[PDB]
Design a protein around this ligand. Structure first.
Ligand SMILES: OC[C@H]1O[C@@H](O)[C@H](O)[C@@H](O)[C@@H]1O
Ligand SMILES: OC[C@H]1O[C@H](O)[C@H](O)[C@@H](O)[C@@H]1O
Ligand SMILES: NS(=O)(=O)c1ccccc1
Ligand SMILES: NS(=O)(=O)c1ccccc1
Ligand SMILES: [Zn+2]
Length: 257
């Protein structure tokens, strides 16, 4: 099954998921000089005040913090988006070392990690129907650099010891995802895909320009997670990122002049 190792990682995925070589795959390198300000973008609205987190799960690839998406609570609107997109989960991708870990790159520079807040377009009723649509999903991507600690991340860090291995989950109620955002909502946007199998080309990507800072100790705890299940040989959950894919017939737009 797919993973991030030498024998099942990104360079193998196309054999089961031929869309891996498709026309709008993610992530991509963001060439900041070629990205163009787009005056047609509307103001972006990240409305997370009523978010209801439920659970945190080690799925063998990353950990997902899951939300109640049975009503409009935490939603993303505006910017490049037509209509309302509901938060379903967030997760991260990270490296074995601070010099790698992000999926998107900025002028080829790799960040230590990248946070993905995943939302589905409510016009399609459910996530499963949304991933049959070209505009089914919106992912808000946020880079992580290592420096000062991110206070709003610490509750996540501290629960990871309870979900060390694949298939473990824990209650994770009353978590406020607003604490994971940077100050500025300046962003780049482009049409792309899921960055893990099934690699579906459903995503409007919104990648914030300003990274968040997390401490070395915080990211080191990400790196203590395991890809394997309980009782199996330990394989540290590190380097769970897909490298940049060809831009092909796309343009990256900037929200800022
Ligand atoms: O034809 C001109 C147009 O070319 C497009 O590729 C750009 O996205 C537009 O911003 C520009 O106005
Ligand atoms: O907010 C997420 C979680 O943070 C801490 O783990 C709290 O102890 C727990 O009650 C809460 O579910
Ligand atoms: N796509 S996958 O599951 O990573 C895969 C790996 C090796 C051979 C065929 C498929
Ligand atoms: N990593 S990603 O593109 O945010 C993603 C989101 C949901 C499912 C699969 C992948
Ligand atoms: Zn992701």
């Amino acid at each position: 099954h797919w993973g991030y190792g030498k024998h099942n990682g990104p360079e193998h995925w196309h054999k089961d998921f031929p869309i891996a070589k498709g026309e709008r795959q993610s992530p991509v390198d963001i060439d900041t000089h070629t990205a163009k300000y787009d005056p047609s973008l509307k103001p972006l609205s990240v409305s997370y005040d009523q978010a209801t987190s439920l659970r945190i799960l080690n799925n063998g690839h990353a950990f997902n913090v899951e939300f109640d998406d049975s009503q409009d609570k935490a939603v993303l609107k505006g910017g490049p988006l037509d209509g309302t997109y509901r938060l379903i989960q967030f997760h991260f991708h990270w490296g074995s070392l601070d010099g790698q870990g992000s999926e998107h790159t900025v002028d080829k520079k790799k960040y230590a990690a990248e946070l993905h807040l995943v939302h589905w377009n409510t016009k399609y009723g459910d996530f499963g129907k949304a991933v049959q649509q070209p505009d089914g999903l919106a992912v808000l991507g946020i880079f992580l650099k290592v420096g000062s600690a991110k206070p709003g991340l610490q509750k996540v860090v501290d629960v990871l010891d309870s979900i060390k291995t694949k298939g473990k989950s824990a209650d994770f109620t009353n978590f406020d995802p607003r604490g994971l955002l940077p100050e500025s909502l300046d962003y780049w946007t482009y049409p792309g895909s899921l960055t893990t199998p099934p690699l579906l080309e459903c995503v409007t990507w919104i990648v914030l320009k300003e990274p968040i800072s997390v401490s070395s100790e915080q990211v080191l705890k990400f790196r203590k997670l395991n890809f394997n299940g309980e009782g199996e040989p330990e394989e540290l959950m590190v380097d769970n990122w897909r490298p940049a894919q060809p831009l092909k017939n796309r343009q990256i737009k900037a929200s800022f002049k």
